[PDB]
Amino acid sequence: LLLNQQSANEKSLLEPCKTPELLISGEEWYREFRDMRQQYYALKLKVNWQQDLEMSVQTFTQVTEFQWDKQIYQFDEKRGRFQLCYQPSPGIYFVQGNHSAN
Amino acid sequence: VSDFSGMIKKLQSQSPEHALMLLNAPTTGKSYTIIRALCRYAIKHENFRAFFVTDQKKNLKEQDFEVAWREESGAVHKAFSERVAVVRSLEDTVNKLINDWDRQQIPDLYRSSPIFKKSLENLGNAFKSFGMMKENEFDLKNAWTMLSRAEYQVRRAMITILADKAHVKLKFKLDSISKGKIREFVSKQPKADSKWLNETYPTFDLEKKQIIILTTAKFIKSYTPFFEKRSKAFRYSPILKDALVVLDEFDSTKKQILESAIDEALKIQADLNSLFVDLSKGLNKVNEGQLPAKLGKSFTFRDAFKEILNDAEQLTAEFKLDFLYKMEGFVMRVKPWNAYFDEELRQVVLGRQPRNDLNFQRMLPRISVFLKGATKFILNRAREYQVSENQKLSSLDDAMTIEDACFSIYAALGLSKSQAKILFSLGHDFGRRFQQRGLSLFQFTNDPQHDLQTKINACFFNETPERYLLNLLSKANVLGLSAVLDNYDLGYLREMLGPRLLDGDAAGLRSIIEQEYLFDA
DNA sequence: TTGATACGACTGCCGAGATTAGATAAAGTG
DNA sequence: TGACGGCTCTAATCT
DNA sequence: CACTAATAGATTAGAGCCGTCACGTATCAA
């Protein structure tokens, strides 16, 4: 929980958050395709049951419209970390996955 | 039904010369008959392309055509839209695009992509601007250009979505290789998205479209291909090769053709003196080596190439077009001017004090007929270079629309764009006086921008609607579903076509045209 | 007079505003 | 079929 | 002219990837 309250920016504080997982991504980890599909990739941080920190890479792709059956992620640019989206919100939505070649 | 099918039957056999089909006359029921027979014909035979031409947008039977295809279709029916293509206008295409975008008519393949989303937003804004412009009662040219740019944006979006999807990239999009890959990819995996693509953009793969229902205005005012931005002309497209073009309301395909021809003639002007001398230098370029040879051979062969050149060189000395004319009202052709050659001035004068009048009035027709003959010769060479280039570059019916061929010939010969346009307009001509050589009006002018020379501006008209019908008769064969200067010249047609003809300043120019028509009659 | 072993491997800058005349250039109908 | 080896997406498993 | 309708996650388990196999330079031993 305390990790989930954190942020990537230097000299930050405890900001409330609703996303179960802490996914950290900035502007450097970002690329576009020929369809201009914004595709970030974050750094998932999680402490497992045996108190080991896991830093696995999570990749997110862009979807135009909301998907009520799939998980929808929105990039919080100010805090520099991805957030879960429970209701339709202004901005650009994201979903887990990386189907491009590289 | 069977009557119209039998009538259309003999056209393919008579397509050895692309015959006439007369004028089946009768009093909406007649139109509904042709669509059923045409549908059955196209369903029965795989290799046959029809060009049903109507006259009014409402008169187009888009609902009647679709309610006759499945009726004539067997169990192994085609995808309708994959064969039937209704050519639409930019305005209605934009309207349909917006309508499909709003209520999810378009498939999700082009919806999930964000570039399509932004292109449709831009298109909607541009269409709002177009509506405001239409409300303004203004010249629709600027707004049409803006709307065309907006639609080209989403068109290009479709290509950039399809290219990476298929096994290709490189984003002309390989107009000989990856175009085939795109068309093949959109023919095997899609089930419903292909239907929408074919229904919305029929020009994406036009060669495989069977029936082309379109209004006469769009039939004579070119069409915009999917991939390319510049609009190719219908009358020259390889698509029209060996086609059967039904002319519904054929009696009305006279005024439209004449009106378009008169605007085309008035719009494109050039100086006769400069245009002739420029052509002769380009013609002399051929004989004296030069040229890329690929084009050089054909020219050295077919002996008449040297006779046109020696004719040019002979009359150049006679009329001194090498020397620049000088001035100190229209001149129609079917108080007068003269021209000496004051050596002192080293030019020729044309002020009236008759000294050595070589009957300049006969100078004009000699140059006119020489230009006509040279342009026909260049047209034949352009056709040869066209067939050669298309044959070595085997491709999906898309190359050298023979406007490009003649324009390339003229650009290699060292001629300007306007001069090339005038020469091609004169050339595309392969009996009464009008239907033989037509009208040729000339008008002198002066300008402080060029005071040492006088531009002999020439307006040329040689494409009467009967000759347009004859050319459409060389490219394809017409039908006669139709039922003084608005009924063609059927006698002249029966004279020319012969064995195959039967069985079952705008205002000024207009006036002039009508006159000699009458005189000829 | 050369054969080892411990460490170098360097990216730029970072807006607003105001003034002109300039052939052109298509193809439409609810 | 340079191959080792971390590890990333993604199908699988598991309520 | 037209839409409404009304929609498993979370956590492992594995195939298959890229990418790293160090290189040109001062410098003490032998």
CSV table of N, CA and C in Angstrom, one decimal, chain B residues 188-279:
chain,number,residue,atom,x,y,z
B,188,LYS,N,-9.0,-12.1,-48.9
B,188,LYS,CA,-9.1,-13.4,-48.3
B,188,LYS,C,-9.4,-13.5,-46.8
B,189,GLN,N,-9.0,-12.5,-46.0
B,189,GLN,CA,-9.2,-12.6,-44.6
B,189,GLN,C,-10.5,-11.8,-44.3
B,190,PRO,N,-10.8,-10.7,-44.9
B,190,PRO,CA,-12.0,-9.9,-44.5
B,190,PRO,C,-13.2,-10.6,-44.8
B,191,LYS,N,-14.3,-10.4,-44.0
B,191,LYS,CA,-15.6,-11.0,-44.3
B,191,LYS,C,-16.6,-9.8,-44.4
B,192,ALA,N,-16.6,-8.9,-43.4
B,192,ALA,CA,-17.6,-7.8,-43.5
B,192,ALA,C,-16.9,-6.5,-43.7
B,193,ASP,N,-15.6,-6.3,-43.3
B,193,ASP,CA,-14.9,-5.1,-43.6
B,193,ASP,C,-14.6,-4.9,-45.1
B,194,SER,N,-14.4,-6.0,-45.8
B,194,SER,CA,-14.2,-5.9,-47.2
B,194,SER,C,-15.5,-5.4,-47.9
B,195,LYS,N,-16.7,-5.8,-47.4
B,195,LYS,CA,-17.9,-5.3,-47.9
B,195,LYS,C,-18.0,-3.8,-47.7
B,196,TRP,N,-17.7,-3.3,-46.5
B,196,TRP,CA,-17.8,-1.8,-46.3
B,196,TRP,C,-16.7,-1.1,-47.2
B,197,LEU,N,-15.5,-1.7,-47.3
B,197,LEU,CA,-14.5,-1.0,-48.1
B,197,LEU,C,-14.9,-0.9,-49.6
B,198,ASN,N,-15.5,-2.0,-50.1
B,198,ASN,CA,-15.9,-2.0,-51.5
B,198,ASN,C,-17.1,-1.1,-51.7
B,199,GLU,N,-18.1,-1.1,-50.7
B,199,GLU,CA,-19.3,-0.3,-50.9
B,199,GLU,C,-18.9,1.2,-50.8
B,200,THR,N,-18.0,1.5,-49.9
B,200,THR,CA,-17.6,2.9,-49.7
B,200,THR,C,-16.6,3.5,-50.7
B,201,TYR,N,-15.5,2.7,-50.9
B,201,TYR,CA,-14.5,3.1,-51.9
B,201,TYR,C,-14.4,2.1,-53.0
B,202,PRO,N,-15.3,2.2,-54.0
B,202,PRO,CA,-15.2,1.3,-55.2
B,202,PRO,C,-13.9,1.4,-56.0
B,203,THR,N,-13.3,2.5,-56.0
B,203,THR,CA,-12.1,2.8,-56.8
B,203,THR,C,-10.9,2.1,-56.2
B,204,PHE,N,-11.0,1.5,-55.0
B,204,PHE,CA,-9.8,0.9,-54.4
B,204,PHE,C,-9.2,-0.2,-55.3
B,205,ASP,N,-10.1,-1.1,-55.8
B,205,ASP,CA,-9.7,-2.1,-56.8
B,205,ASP,C,-10.8,-2.1,-57.9
B,206,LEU,N,-10.5,-1.2,-58.9
B,206,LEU,CA,-11.6,-1.0,-59.9
B,206,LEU,C,-11.5,-2.0,-61.0
B,207,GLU,N,-10.4,-2.6,-61.3
B,207,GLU,CA,-10.2,-3.5,-62.4
B,207,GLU,C,-11.1,-4.8,-62.2
B,208,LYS,N,-11.3,-5.2,-60.9
B,208,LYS,CA,-12.1,-6.4,-60.6
B,208,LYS,C,-13.6,-6.0,-60.5
B,209,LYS,N,-14.0,-4.7,-60.5
B,209,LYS,CA,-15.4,-4.4,-60.5
B,209,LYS,C,-16.0,-4.7,-61.8
B,210,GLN,N,-17.2,-5.2,-61.8
B,210,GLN,CA,-17.9,-5.7,-63.0
B,210,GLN,C,-18.8,-4.6,-63.6
B,211,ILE,N,-19.8,-4.2,-62.9
B,211,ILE,CA,-20.7,-3.2,-63.4
B,211,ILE,C,-20.4,-1.8,-62.7
B,212,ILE,N,-20.2,-0.8,-63.6
B,212,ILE,CA,-19.9,0.5,-63.1
B,212,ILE,C,-21.1,1.5,-63.4
B,213,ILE,N,-22.0,1.6,-62.5
B,213,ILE,CA,-23.1,2.6,-62.6
B,213,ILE,C,-22.7,3.9,-62.1
B,214,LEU,N,-22.8,4.9,-63.0
B,214,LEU,CA,-22.3,6.3,-62.7
B,214,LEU,C,-23.1,7.3,-63.6
B,215,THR,N,-23.2,8.5,-63.1
B,215,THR,CA,-23.8,9.6,-63.9
B,215,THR,C,-22.9,10.0,-65.0
B,216,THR,N,-23.4,10.6,-66.0
B,216,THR,CA,-22.6,11.1,-67.1
B,216,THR,C,-21.6,12.2,-66.7
B,217,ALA,N,-22.0,13.0,-65.8
B,217,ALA,CA,-21.1,14.1,-65.4
B,217,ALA,C,-19.8,13.5,-64.8
B,218,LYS,N,-20.0,12.5,-63.9
B,218,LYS,CA,-18.8,11.9,-63.4
B,218,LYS,C,-18.1,11.0,-64.4
B,219,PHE,N,-18.8,10.6,-65.4
B,219,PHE,CA,-18.3,9.8,-66.5
B,219,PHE,C,-17.3,10.6,-67.4
B,220,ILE,N,-17.6,11.9,-67.5
B,220,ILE,CA,-16.8,12.8,-68.3
B,220,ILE,C,-15.9,13.8,-67.5
B,221,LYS,N,-16.0,13.8,-66.2
B,221,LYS,CA,-15.2,14.7,-65.3
B,221,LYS,C,-14.2,14.0,-64.4
B,222,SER,N,-13.7,12.8,-64.9
B,222,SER,CA,-12.6,12.1,-64.2
B,222,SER,C,-13.0,11.6,-62.8
B,223,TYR,N,-12.2,10.7,-62.3
B,223,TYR,CA,-12.4,10.1,-60.9
B,223,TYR,C,-11.1,10.1,-60.2
B,224,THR,N,-11.2,10.1,-58.8
B,224,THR,CA,-10.0,10.1,-58.0
B,224,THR,C,-9.7,8.7,-57.6
B,225,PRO,N,-8.6,8.1,-58.0
B,225,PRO,CA,-8.2,6.8,-57.5
B,225,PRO,C,-7.9,6.8,-56.0
B,226,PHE,N,-8.0,5.6,-55.4
B,226,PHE,CA,-7.8,5.4,-54.0
B,226,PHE,C,-6.4,5.9,-53.6
B,227,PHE,N,-5.3,5.2,-54.1
B,227,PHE,CA,-4.0,5.4,-53.6
B,227,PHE,C,-3.4,6.7,-54.1
B,228,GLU,N,-3.6,7.0,-55.4
B,228,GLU,CA,-3.1,8.2,-56.0
B,228,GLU,C,-4.0,9.4,-55.6
B,229,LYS,N,-3.3,10.6,-55.6
B,229,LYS,CA,-4.0,11.9,-55.3
B,229,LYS,C,-4.6,12.5,-56.5
B,230,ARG,N,-3.9,12.6,-57.6
B,230,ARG,CA,-4.4,13.2,-58.8
B,230,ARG,C,-5.4,12.3,-59.5
B,231,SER,N,-6.5,13.0,-60.0
B,231,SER,CA,-7.7,12.3,-60.5
B,231,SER,C,-7.4,11.9,-61.9
B,232,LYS,N,-7.5,10.6,-62.2
B,232,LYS,CA,-7.3,10.1,-63.6
B,232,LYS,C,-8.7,10.3,-64.4
B,233,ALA,N,-8.5,10.5,-65.7
B,233,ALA,CA,-9.7,10.7,-66.5
B,233,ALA,C,-10.3,9.4,-66.9
B,234,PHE,N,-11.7,9.3,-67.0
B,234,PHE,CA,-12.4,8.1,-67.4
B,234,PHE,C,-12.1,7.8,-68.8
B,235,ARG,N,-12.1,8.8,-69.7
B,235,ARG,CA,-12.0,8.5,-71.1
B,235,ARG,C,-10.7,7.9,-71.6
B,236,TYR,N,-9.7,7.9,-70.7
B,236,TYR,CA,-8.4,7.4,-71.1
B,236,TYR,C,-8.0,6.2,-70.2
B,237,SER,N,-8.7,5.8,-69.2
B,237,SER,CA,-8.3,4.8,-68.2
B,237,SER,C,-8.3,3.4,-68.9
B,238,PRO,N,-7.2,2.6,-68.7
B,238,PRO,CA,-7.3,1.2,-69.2
B,238,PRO,C,-8.5,0.5,-68.7
B,239,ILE,N,-9.2,1.0,-67.7
B,239,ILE,CA,-10.4,0.3,-67.3
B,239,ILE,C,-11.4,0.2,-68.4
B,240,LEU,N,-11.5,1.3,-69.2
B,240,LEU,CA,-12.5,1.4,-70.3
B,240,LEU,C,-12.2,0.5,-71.4
B,241,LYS,N,-11.1,-0.2,-71.4
B,241,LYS,CA,-10.6,-1.1,-72.5
B,241,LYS,C,-11.6,-2.3,-72.6
B,242,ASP,N,-12.1,-2.4,-73.9
B,242,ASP,CA,-13.0,-3.5,-74.2
B,242,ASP,C,-14.2,-3.6,-73.3
B,243,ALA,N,-14.7,-2.4,-72.9
B,243,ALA,CA,-15.9,-2.4,-72.1
B,243,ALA,C,-17.2,-2.2,-72.9
B,244,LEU,N,-18.3,-2.5,-72.2
B,244,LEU,CA,-19.6,-2.3,-72.8
B,244,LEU,C,-20.3,-1.2,-72.0
B,245,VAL,N,-20.5,0.0,-72.6
B,245,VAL,CA,-21.0,1.2,-71.9
B,245,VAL,C,-22.5,1.4,-72.4
B,246,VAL,N,-23.4,1.1,-71.4
B,246,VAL,CA,-24.8,1.4,-71.7
B,246,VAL,C,-25.0,2.9,-71.4
B,247,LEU,N,-25.6,3.6,-72.4
B,247,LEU,CA,-25.9,5.0,-72.3
B,247,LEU,C,-27.4,5.2,-72.1
B,248,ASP,N,-27.9,5.1,-70.9
B,248,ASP,CA,-29.3,5.4,-70.5
B,248,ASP,C,-29.5,6.9,-70.7
B,249,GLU,N,-30.6,7.2,-71.3
B,249,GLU,CA,-30.9,8.6,-71.6
B,249,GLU,C,-29.8,9.2,-72.6
B,250,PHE,N,-29.4,8.4,-73.5
B,250,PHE,CA,-28.3,8.7,-74.4
B,250,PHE,C,-28.5,10.0,-75.1
B,251,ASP,N,-29.8,10.4,-75.4
B,251,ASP,CA,-30.1,11.7,-76.0
B,251,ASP,C,-29.5,12.9,-75.1
B,252,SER,N,-29.4,12.7,-73.8
B,252,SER,CA,-28.9,13.7,-73.0
B,252,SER,C,-27.4,13.7,-72.8
B,253,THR,N,-26.7,12.7,-73.4
B,253,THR,CA,-25.2,12.7,-73.4
B,253,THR,C,-24.6,13.5,-74.5
B,254,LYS,N,-25.4,14.4,-75.1
B,254,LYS,CA,-25.0,15.3,-76.1
B,254,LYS,C,-24.7,16.7,-75.6
B,255,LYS,N,-25.7,17.3,-74.9
B,255,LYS,CA,-25.5,18.6,-74.4
B,255,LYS,C,-24.3,18.7,-73.3
B,256,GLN,N,-24.3,17.6,-72.5
B,256,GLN,CA,-23.2,17.6,-71.5
B,256,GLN,C,-21.8,17.5,-72.2
B,257,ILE,N,-21.7,16.7,-73.2
B,257,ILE,CA,-20.4,16.5,-73.9
B,257,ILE,C,-20.0,17.8,-74.6
B,258,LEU,N,-21.0,18.5,-75.2
B,258,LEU,CA,-20.7,19.7,-75.9
B,258,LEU,C,-20.3,20.8,-75.0
B,259,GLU,N,-21.1,20.9,-73.9
B,259,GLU,CA,-20.7,21.9,-72.9
B,259,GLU,C,-19.4,21.7,-72.2
B,260,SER,N,-19.0,20.5,-71.9
B,260,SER,CA,-17.7,20.2,-71.4
B,260,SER,C,-16.6,20.5,-72.4
B,261,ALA,N,-16.8,20.2,-73.7
B,261,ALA,CA,-15.8,20.4,-74.7
B,261,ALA,C,-15.6,21.9,-74.9
B,262,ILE,N,-16.7,22.7,-74.9
B,262,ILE,CA,-16.5,24.1,-75.1
B,262,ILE,C,-15.8,24.8,-73.9
B,263,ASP,N,-16.0,24.4,-72.7
B,263,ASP,CA,-15.3,24.9,-71.6
B,263,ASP,C,-13.8,24.4,-71.6
B,264,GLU,N,-13.6,23.2,-72.1
B,264,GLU,CA,-12.2,22.7,-72.2
B,264,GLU,C,-11.4,23.5,-73.2
B,265,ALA,N,-12.1,23.8,-74.4
B,265,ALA,CA,-11.4,24.6,-75.4
B,265,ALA,C,-11.2,26.0,-75.0
B,266,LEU,N,-12.1,26.6,-74.3
B,266,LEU,CA,-11.9,28.0,-73.9
B,266,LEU,C,-10.9,28.1,-72.8
B,267,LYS,N,-10.8,27.1,-71.9
B,267,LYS,CA,-9.9,27.2,-70.7
B,267,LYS,C,-8.5,27.0,-71.1
B,268,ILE,N,-8.1,26.3,-72.2
B,268,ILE,CA,-6.8,26.0,-72.5
B,268,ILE,C,-6.4,26.8,-73.8
B,269,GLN,N,-5.6,27.8,-73.6
B,269,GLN,CA,-5.1,28.6,-74.7
B,269,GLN,C,-3.6,28.6,-74.8
B,270,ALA,N,-3.1,28.9,-76.0
B,270,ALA,CA,-1.7,28.9,-76.3
B,270,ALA,C,-1.4,29.7,-77.6
B,271,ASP,N,-0.2,30.2,-77.7
B,271,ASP,CA,0.2,31.0,-78.9
B,271,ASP,C,0.5,30.0,-80.0
B,272,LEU,N,-0.1,30.2,-81.2
B,272,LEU,CA,0.2,29.3,-82.3
B,272,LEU,C,1.6,29.4,-82.8
B,273,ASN,N,2.2,30.6,-82.9
B,273,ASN,CA,3.5,30.8,-83.4
B,273,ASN,C,4.6,30.1,-82.6
B,274,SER,N,4.5,30.3,-81.3
B,274,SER,CA,5.5,29.7,-80.4
B,274,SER,C,5.3,28.2,-80.3
B,275,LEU,N,4.1,27.8,-80.3
B,275,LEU,CA,3.8,26.3,-80.2
B,275,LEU,C,4.3,25.6,-81.4
B,276,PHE,N,4.1,26.1,-82.6
B,276,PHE,CA,4.6,25.4,-83.8
B,276,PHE,C,6.1,25.3,-83.8
B,277,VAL,N,6.8,26.4,-83.6
B,277,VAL,CA,8.2,26.4,-83.7
B,277,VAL,C,8.8,25.5,-82.6
B,278,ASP,N,8.2,25.5,-81.4
B,278,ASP,CA,8.7,24.6,-80.4
B,278,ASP,C,8.6,23.1,-80.8
B,279,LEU,N,7.4,22.8,-81.4
B,279,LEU,CA,7.2,21.4,-81.8
B,279,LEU,C,8.3,21.0,-82.9
